[PDB]
Design an enzyme around this catalytic site. Structure first.
Site, short mmCIF file in Angstrom:
data_model
loop_
_atom_site.label_atom_id
_atom_site.label_comp_id
_atom_site.label_asym_id
_atom_site.label_seq_id
_atom_site.Cartn_x
_atom_site.Cartn_y
_atom_site.Cartn_z
N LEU B 37 -66.41 -15.88 122.16
CA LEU B 37 -66.09 -17.06 121.40
C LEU B 37 -66.23 -16.61 119.95
N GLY B 38 -65.46 -17.23 119.07
CA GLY B 38 -65.51 -16.85 117.67
C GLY B 38 -64.23 -16.15 117.28
N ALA B 113 -55.10 -17.21 129.88
CA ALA B 113 -54.11 -18.24 130.14
C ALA B 113 -52.70 -17.71 130.18
N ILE B 181 -57.24 -5.06 104.60
CA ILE B 181 -58.06 -4.47 105.66
C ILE B 181 -58.19 -2.95 105.45
N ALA B 316 -58.43 -17.05 107.99
CA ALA B 316 -59.25 -17.93 108.83
C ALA B 316 -59.08 -19.40 108.52
N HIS B 440 -73.79 -20.67 80.62
CA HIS B 440 -73.85 -19.49 79.75
C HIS B 440 -75.20 -18.80 79.90
C1 LIG Z 1 -61.02 -6.49 110.38
C2 LIG Z 1 -60.23 -7.70 109.86
C3 LIG Z 1 -60.65 -8.32 108.68
C4 LIG Z 1 -60.23 -9.62 108.39
N1 LIG Z 1 -60.74 -10.26 107.32
C5 LIG Z 1 -60.47 -11.55 107.05
C6 LIG Z 1 -61.10 -12.21 105.99
O1 LIG Z 1 -62.15 -11.77 105.52
N2 LIG Z 1 -60.70 -13.52 105.67
C7 LIG Z 1 -59.71 -14.15 106.43
O2 LIG Z 1 -59.41 -15.32 106.22
N3 LIG Z 1 -59.18 -13.51 107.47
C8 LIG Z 1 -59.54 -12.25 107.80
N4 LIG Z 1 -58.96 -11.60 108.91
C9 LIG Z 1 -57.96 -12.34 109.68
C10 LIG Z 1 -58.65 -13.50 110.37
O3 LIG Z 1 -59.70 -13.01 111.19
C11 LIG Z 1 -57.67 -14.29 111.20
O4 LIG Z 1 -56.79 -14.87 110.24
C12 LIG Z 1 -58.34 -15.42 111.97
O5 LIG Z 1 -59.28 -14.87 112.89
C13 LIG Z 1 -57.29 -16.11 112.83
O6 LIG Z 1 -57.88 -17.12 113.62
P1 LIG Z 1 -57.10 -17.55 114.94
O7 LIG Z 1 -57.90 -18.59 115.62
O8 LIG Z 1 -55.66 -17.79 114.66
O9 LIG Z 1 -57.20 -16.20 115.79
P2 LIG Z 1 -58.31 -15.31 116.52
O10 LIG Z 1 -59.60 -15.26 115.80
O11 LIG Z 1 -57.62 -14.03 116.82
O12 LIG Z 1 -58.67 -16.01 117.90
C14 LIG Z 1 -57.80 -15.73 118.99
C15 LIG Z 1 -58.50 -15.88 120.32
O13 LIG Z 1 -57.46 -16.07 121.28
C16 LIG Z 1 -58.03 -15.45 122.42
N5 LIG Z 1 -56.92 -15.29 123.34
C17 LIG Z 1 -55.78 -14.63 123.11
N6 LIG Z 1 -54.97 -14.73 124.17
C18 LIG Z 1 -55.64 -15.47 125.04
C19 LIG Z 1 -55.36 -15.87 126.28
N7 LIG Z 1 -54.19 -15.54 126.82
N8 LIG Z 1 -56.26 -16.58 126.99
C20 LIG Z 1 -57.45 -16.91 126.48
N9 LIG Z 1 -57.78 -16.53 125.26
C21 LIG Z 1 -56.89 -15.83 124.55
C22 LIG Z 1 -58.53 -14.13 121.89
O14 LIG Z 1 -59.42 -13.42 122.76
C23 LIG Z 1 -59.26 -14.59 120.66
O15 LIG Z 1 -60.67 -14.73 120.95
C24 LIG Z 1 -59.33 -10.28 109.24
C25 LIG Z 1 -58.85 -9.63 110.37
C26 LIG Z 1 -59.31 -8.35 110.69
C27 LIG Z 1 -59.00 -7.75 112.06
C1 LIG Z 2 -85.44 -15.65 75.81
C2 LIG Z 2 -84.40 -16.75 75.65
C3 LIG Z 2 -83.50 -16.95 76.68
C4 LIG Z 2 -82.51 -17.91 76.53
N1 LIG Z 2 -81.61 -18.04 77.51
C5 LIG Z 2 -80.57 -18.88 77.41
C6 LIG Z 2 -79.58 -18.85 78.39
O1 LIG Z 2 -79.70 -18.12 79.37
N2 LIG Z 2 -78.46 -19.66 78.23
C7 LIG Z 2 -78.35 -20.48 77.10
O2 LIG Z 2 -77.33 -21.14 76.91
N3 LIG Z 2 -79.32 -20.49 76.16
C8 LIG Z 2 -80.41 -19.71 76.30
N4 LIG Z 2 -81.34 -19.61 75.27
C9 LIG Z 2 -81.21 -20.56 74.14
C10 LIG Z 2 -80.21 -20.08 73.09
O3 LIG Z 2 -80.70 -18.88 72.45
C11 LIG Z 2 -80.05 -21.18 72.05
O4 LIG Z 2 -79.82 -22.45 72.69
C12 LIG Z 2 -78.90 -20.85 71.11
O5 LIG Z 2 -79.08 -19.57 70.52
C13 LIG Z 2 -78.87 -21.86 69.98
O6 LIG Z 2 -77.95 -21.45 68.97
P1 LIG Z 2 -77.95 -22.15 67.53
O7 LIG Z 2 -76.66 -21.73 66.91
O8 LIG Z 2 -78.31 -23.60 67.63
O9 LIG Z 2 -79.15 -21.37 66.85
P2 LIG Z 2 -79.67 -19.88 66.88
O10 LIG Z 2 -78.90 -19.10 67.88
O11 LIG Z 2 -81.13 -19.91 67.02
O12 LIG Z 2 -79.22 -19.33 65.45
C14 LIG Z 2 -79.60 -20.00 64.25
C15 LIG Z 2 -79.49 -19.02 63.09
O13 LIG Z 2 -79.91 -19.62 61.87
C16 LIG Z 2 -80.46 -18.58 61.06
N5 LIG Z 2 -81.23 -19.28 60.01
C17 LIG Z 2 -82.19 -20.18 60.25
N6 LIG Z 2 -82.47 -20.81 59.11
C18 LIG Z 2 -81.72 -20.27 58.17
C19 LIG Z 2 -81.61 -20.46 56.84
N7 LIG Z 2 -82.27 -21.44 56.25
N8 LIG Z 2 -80.84 -19.67 56.09
C20 LIG Z 2 -80.15 -18.67 56.63
N9 LIG Z 2 -80.19 -18.46 57.94
C21 LIG Z 2 -80.95 -19.26 58.71
C22 LIG Z 2 -81.27 -17.77 62.04
O14 LIG Z 2 -81.44 -16.40 61.65
C23 LIG Z 2 -80.37 -17.80 63.26
O15 LIG Z 2 -79.57 -16.61 63.27
C24 LIG Z 2 -82.39 -18.68 75.36
C25 LIG Z 2 -83.30 -18.48 74.33
C26 LIG Z 2 -84.31 -17.53 74.48
C27 LIG Z 2 -85.31 -17.38 73.34
#
Ligand SMILES: Cc1cc2nc3c(=O)[nH]c(=O)nc-3n(C[C@H](O)[C@H](O)[C@H](O)COP(=O)(O)OP(=O)(O)OC[C@H]3O[C@@H](n4cnc5c(N)ncnc54)[C@H](O)[C@@H]3O)c2cc1C
Ligand SMILES: Cc1cc2nc3c(=O)[nH]c(=O)nc-3n(C[C@H](O)[C@H](O)[C@H](O)COP(=O)(O)OP(=O)(O)OC[C@H]3O[C@@H](n4cnc5c(N)ncnc54)[C@H](O)[C@@H]3O)c2cc1C
EC number: 1.8.1.4
Lengths: 41, 455, 455
Positions: B37-38, B113, B181, B316, B440
């Site tokens: 199955l699957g 089948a 593939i 799939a 961000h």
């Molecule tokens: C290695 C590989 C990588 C893939 N990667 C992806 C991916 O990452 N993303 C994606 O979307 N697709 C991927 N695919 C394709 C994807 O798996 C198929 O699009 C999807 O499985 C199709 O689903 P289905 O139900 O049409 O067929 P199937 O999964 O083939 O199911 C068919 C079933 O019918 C059964 N069957 C057949 N004849 C009979 C019968 N006469 N009586 C009873 N049972 C029967 C079979 O045994 C089987 O179990 C990949 C395929 C391969 C081989």
């Molecule tokens: C460790 C850490 C991790 C963070 N991680 C994230 C994150 O992952 N994602 C996110 O969105 N935010 C994050 N932040 C917050 C982010 O840094 C601030 O929200 C963002 O920088 C604010 O920008 P701003 O322009 O308001 O001021 P700031 O970036 O602080 O810049 C203000 C500027 O004004 C200048 N300045 C100040 N006063 C004067 C002045 N009087 N005269 C001249 N220059 C002056 C300073 O030098 C500075 O360059 C993080 C902050 C820290 C400390």
């Protein structure tokens, strides 16, 4: 309920989205819904 | 004989969700499966490959984080453990499907089948055959790889399933066919240390994706030691009891490559043969696929077809999707397979993904479009990950800025694509994305900065 | 003396982007900066922070992929190289900023700006003091660390910036303040091998996030040998001139702990003091935050304020967004601050991301909201990644299926957040997402299965 773009539209067009044609479909205000409240009158 | 309401043939992504849905829709469904199955996805497709690819990257990384000042000395890989782990994963998921089916009282039937008429199927198992007459039927048999003559699958001439089940990392491996593939399984073994040689007959690998995307993948793949030969014509192989010698002609020159195994990934053919479909009157398309309507109904009303045997991207989700639609149409419930787009993803080193139109197909379809592209290199998160190769392309309809297609090549493109996919279905315009504040510093921030460029 | 049109004080994310959209709008811009361009985020904030964490995880993973059969030996960490690397990332991005400004021909002035009056500022560059007359100005001065009463900063009692520049991996570090900054820097060093103790005054670390999310993050810290002391009151630190003794009270008990360094990350205060704003008539709040309207205008009409000095989430993107709004409003553009939410991401081991309302906040707001929670343990890709601790939660308005908040804890949560974010911002429903076909097998698709659960 409205896409950022639609909201921008009303903004630049000086319209009050808060009270604009909820054209429906999803229950949201569309660009034209804005046009209706605006160009309509 | 045995009577049933809705007979489902195949328990892959399409067959089982279709069986589930149909049961939930009050129908009494009997699902027929000959193997595990699957289906392909869980047993020898999606899961096993991603599992393997995932392990290979843990290896690529441990062994090459040099620049970041982490020096690992002597990185080993117990492929036995790798396979055990892969095994347990697959078992968990198949166990699940098995559960879902019972938990909706679908009678699973082990057997193969065959359509005896447009209303009855013979199921064979062991030396016993049982006849089932159904009210409705959903063919979800999937596809299988193409055995090329003079490349008849053997102990050393593998198919995707064989490469997935290798006991130990081969020193060398030749890959015939540069599709997803092929590229995936090729890159994976390349990460583990295997000298890979991929031969594609067309001018470029990854047919389907823009050449630019294929370019980045080749550039990095060459750094990994992989060799890519396009326009190559594989001729055959002389299999030694310790390797295989592949002969091929590339650009008017016949050459030879000794390797441990050969992997033929030149495509997949639908499992629509010797099923009786020919007899009951199922009109098949030029490529063996079964033609169906917007409800996946075949030429015989009470018979539907879904997944890999039906036209469209062999993915799939297309399968599970069409699965649902089918049971709906069966249960009267009005439905249609009218989705907007299915995203496609390839797990190459720089991950790939696309959804909606490519600049090309949009233009050739006579659509006015603009293409906005943003490099991962101009991104703090990408720099932090130390992976600047990659870009995000956005193709928006010029006559309203509505987004119609998006392509990503870089880290987490398979996750990033989700956002762009939603927009495309929602008919969102580039501005809608540009006005939205993304996190961000993240890779997703790029989508916002790309839509920015589109304005 | 030197006349200009739009003067921008500060070159931070909010500062430079403001200095750019303005120039875009024909404005004659002069930006002042006491230190380096890019501000806190690029130099000593977001970028260095994530870079150090990335390096730290490459390290964690190298030494711990034993479950996938990857076994290294003697994995060395060269902090000097780590720092060198991080330093290049920063210098790379900094150049970009300098480039963008110059390219847009923004006048860059090095100096500490001081407001002489509502239309004049003098900038002191050492013994130098010049006077710039402007039409309108944008104050984006940012924020700075809070120095705890008995924890006087020194080379052993660090602030975030001090920890980011450590020359070596500390034998032990005591982190006072369990917030995102405290948790990020603490975990990174915990990854490099440092004995880390976190002391949070509250009952739970990561105060602004669900207790469930924190529980998971804490559970992994414990696995790493991190001792998290909640409900602790830090009383003081004595620099032993070779390490530091920290005394804290907790559950009545008054204990002391020795460490090589102590990192104080209790909060950040606005850089609105000693700027002259009080004389200029700019209304502020008791804390120091400037009162501002929908167009980031202060009480003095030609003076705008953005970033950390105004209310809202202390985030680089909230700053940048306002930066644009400011310049546009200056130009005439009827711009305003309009967003329904901003995503916040924490780069903890299982990284976490949040946007919109938390289930609780919703109901406390007087909203009938349903909450769907879906586990990564079920998702196929998560299984492949072998990181199954985590989940996605959708806070949906029961009255219209409109998603108002979302929380993800697990791998790539920072990138998966984008989809849910775009959905909130545009007012989409659980059905909108559930009817969108996602990629398989990916993590982003969990959103699809969670919305399915919501429906
Ligand atoms: C290695 C590989 C990588 C893939 N990667 C992806 C991916 O990452 N993303 C994606 O979307 N697709 C991927 N695919 C394709 C994807 O798996 C198929 O699009 C999807 O499985 C199709 O689903 P289905 O139900 O049409 O067929 P199937 O999964 O083939 O199911 C068919 C079933 O019918 C059964 N069957 C057949 N004849 C009979 C019968 N006469 N009586 C009873 N049972 C029967 C079979 O045994 C089987 O179990 C990949 C395929 C391969 C081989
Ligand atoms: C460790 C850490 C991790 C963070 N991680 C994230 C994150 O992952 N994602 C996110 O969105 N935010 C994050 N932040 C917050 C982010 O840094 C601030 O929200 C963002 O920088 C604010 O920008 P701003 O322009 O308001 O001021 P700031 O970036 O602080 O810049 C203000 C500027 O004004 C200048 N300045 C100040 N006063 C004067 C002045 N009087 N005269 C001249 N220059 C002056 C300073 O030098 C500075 O360059 C993080 C902050 C820290 C400390």
């Amino acid at each position: 309920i409205a896409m950022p773009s639609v909201r921008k539209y009303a903004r630049e067009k000086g319209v009050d989205i808060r009270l604009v044609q909820g054209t429906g479909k999803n229950g949201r205000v569309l660009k034209e819904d804005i046009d209706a409240f605006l160009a309509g009158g | 004989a045995i009577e049933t309401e809705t007979l489902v043939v195949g328990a892959g992504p399409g067959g089982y969700v279709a069986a589930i849905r149909a049961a939930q829709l009050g129908q009494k469904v009997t699902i027929v499966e000959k193997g595990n199955l699957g289906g392909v996805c869980l047993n020898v497709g999606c899961i096993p490959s991603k599992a393997l690819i995932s392990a290979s990257h843990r290896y690529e990384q441990a062994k090459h984080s040099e620049e970041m000042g982490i020096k690992a000395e002597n990185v080993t890989i117990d492929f036995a453990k790798v396979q055990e782990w892969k095994a347990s994963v697959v078992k968990k998921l198949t166990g699940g499907v098995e559960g879902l089916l019972k938990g909706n009282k679908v009678e699973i039937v082990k057997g193969e089948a065959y359509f005896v008429d447009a209303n009855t199927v013979r199921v064979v198992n062991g030396d016993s055959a049982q006849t089932y007459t159904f009210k409705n039927a959903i063919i979800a048999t999937g596809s299988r790889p193409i055995e090329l003559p003079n490349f008849k699958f053997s102990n050393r001439i593998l198919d995707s399933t064989g490469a997935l089940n290798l006991g130990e990392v081969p020193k060398s491996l030749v890959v015939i066919g540069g599709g997803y593939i092929g590229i995936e399984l090729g890159t994976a073994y390349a990460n583990f240390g295997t000298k890979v040689t991929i031969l594609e007959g067309a001018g470029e690998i990854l047919s389907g994706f823009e050449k630019q995307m294929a370019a980045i993948i080749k550039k990095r793949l060459k750094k990994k030691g992989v060799e890519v030969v396009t326009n190559a014509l594989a001729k055959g192989a002389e299999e030694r009891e310790d390797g295989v010698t592949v002969t091929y002609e590339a650009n008017g020159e016949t050459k030879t490559i000794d390797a441990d195994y050969v992997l033929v990934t030149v495509g997949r053919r639908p499992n629509t043969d010797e099923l009786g479909l020919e007899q009951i009157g199922i009109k098949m398309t030029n490529r063996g696929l079964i033609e169906v309507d917007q409800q996946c109904r075949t030429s015989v009303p009470n018979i539907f077809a879904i997944g890999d045997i039906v036209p469209g991207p062999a993915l799939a989700h297309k399968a599970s999707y069409e699965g649902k639609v089918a049971a709906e149409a069966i249960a009267g419930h009005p439905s249609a397979v009218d989705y907007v787009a299915i995203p496609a993803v390839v797990f190459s080193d720089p991950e790939c993904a696309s959804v909606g139109y490519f600049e090309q197909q949009a233009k050739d379809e006579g659509i006015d479009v603009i293409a906005a592209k943003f490099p991962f290199a101009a991104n703090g998160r990408a720099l932090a990950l130390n992976d600047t190769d990659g870009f995000l392309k956005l193709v928006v309809r010029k006559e309203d800025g509505v987004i119609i297609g998006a392509q990503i090549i870089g880290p987490n493109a398979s996750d990033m694509i989700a956002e762009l996919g939603l927009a495309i279905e929602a008919g969102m315009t580039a501005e809608d994305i540009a006005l939205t504040i993304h996190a961000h510093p993240t890779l997703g921030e790029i989508a916002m900065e790309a839509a920015e460029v589109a304005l």
